[model samples]
Target: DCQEHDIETTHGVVHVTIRGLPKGNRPVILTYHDIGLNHKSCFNAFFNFEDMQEITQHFAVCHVDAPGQQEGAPSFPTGYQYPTMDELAEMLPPVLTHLSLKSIIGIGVGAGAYILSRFALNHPELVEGLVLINVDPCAKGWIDTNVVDIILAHHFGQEELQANLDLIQTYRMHIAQDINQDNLQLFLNSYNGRRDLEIERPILGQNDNKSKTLKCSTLLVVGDNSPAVEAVVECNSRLNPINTTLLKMADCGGLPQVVQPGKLTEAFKYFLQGMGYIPSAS
Candidate 1:
């Protein structure tokens, strides 16, 4: 039960694939992809996992690809400007409004996680829970001048890349053969231009409208071997402790969803159950 559409927005047209129709109780399990990969490349392995079916069967899944990032998408002409990270956040509301969805349980990876965090910061009411993988809340001030190789380290840890040559080469092949390189670079540049979240831990007794942070439950996941581990840890320290869960998965690479879906599924079930959406015991 899946369908696809290209939804028009202020930023640009975004391609979305919807799995199952959603309603109030059965809210959409919305996913946003990272820079180098589309929704299919980033999320399909995790969403289609055998254990994940237990959760997916009960909720609709919505996968959002960044502008011009979906497979078979036409390359943007030379000098085409991709939307900024903030603009990318702005592009998401239309997807919800178009589908008549009130809220979502967001799942985002890397740059996608940063975008969703911005979205949640802007529109807290439209989010129920968030599962952020390899999220980094810092700005680009710390970025290296060398791009692609550094990005490869950001995706697959340097240690893993040094140990296993094929893993890096295969994805490099995909980046050239499968994905449009020009469009990928534009997205990468946009990601690198991201601003800091400026979020802080809530001061429980006071009402501060100026402070921007997530108001809903969040699960921050990063592999123990991931380059983003320290970043995720820093992000957790900034979030409200009551609603945040930090998961450091062991023996996994940066792509935990691809390598350790079962563990993630187990944690996700607990996360859902805590939010009062557990499967009934028969």
Candidate 2:
């Protein structure tokens, strides 16, 4: 049911896990994970959810783990350089070419969202659609806080953390205990230095051709109570409304894919239907 391949990019090797084979001309489902976590730790529960089968069963799924970020990955040597966010985007063409993917429906979270957006911006023809969750479009400065705090804030809303200690502890345990510290630091450093997407809202009739933006149909999803709500809203505003759908899931947190997979799966089906991929139910 699953096969893993490590393809070399311009900089280094990226590990990709493919589930099912791409059939005919149908586009594959390509996924990317966020900072501090690998593909499995971040997406396994969501993609493997019972409801996702409706979509997953119909398309090949590719999970791209950031370099050195997969489970049991050997730690990079001290001071070893990691790929920048742009270089990370540069890594995907090889994966697509290696897998013989004609096109893809991208599902990305946080850092993954930014990377996919960069890829889609550079190669619009290769992407059919995008589902970006908890995506922060702005570039950020280096953080002075502890990595666990950063991961916690990125994953949960301020309200959730203030309300429950147990919930905070659970995620803290996972980040601090489960993930490889060295590799996490390297990925985190690269993410911290990411350049802004520089995407702007389209003007009604003005030439304004200098601003950059993605051209594919995009589904912008964010939890209403998530820490990233504001950022996601900003992203929605910048995207052309004609090809974008902004969905705010109420009572959910930063990790909507994990907390609300069934809702997301249904929305994804509708998004696909809009793109003429899935037929509407009577």
lDDT of each: 0.86, 0.86
TM-score of 1: 0.93
Which pairs of residues collide in model 1?
Answer: none
- The deviation in Å at residue 194 for candidate 2 is 0.7
lDDT of 1: 0.86
lDDT of 2 by residue, 119-175 (tens): 999899999989998888888755555888888887888888788677578668877
User: Which residue runs does candidate 2 get wrong by more than 4 Å?
Assistant: 141-145, 162-167, 280-282
Q: C-alpha displacement of 123 in model 2, angstroms?
A: 0.8
TM-scores for all candidates: the values are 0.93, 0.95
Candidate 1: where is the Cα deviation over 4 Å? Answer: 142-148, 205-210
List model 1 lDDT by residue over 1-282, tens digit each: 878989999788999999977866557999998877888778888888988887887789999989887888898999987899999999889999998888999999999999999999899989999999999999879553444565677699878888867767866565555567778888998899898889887878975566778989999999988988999999999899899999999898888887789899898898898898965631
RMSD of each: 2.0, 1.7
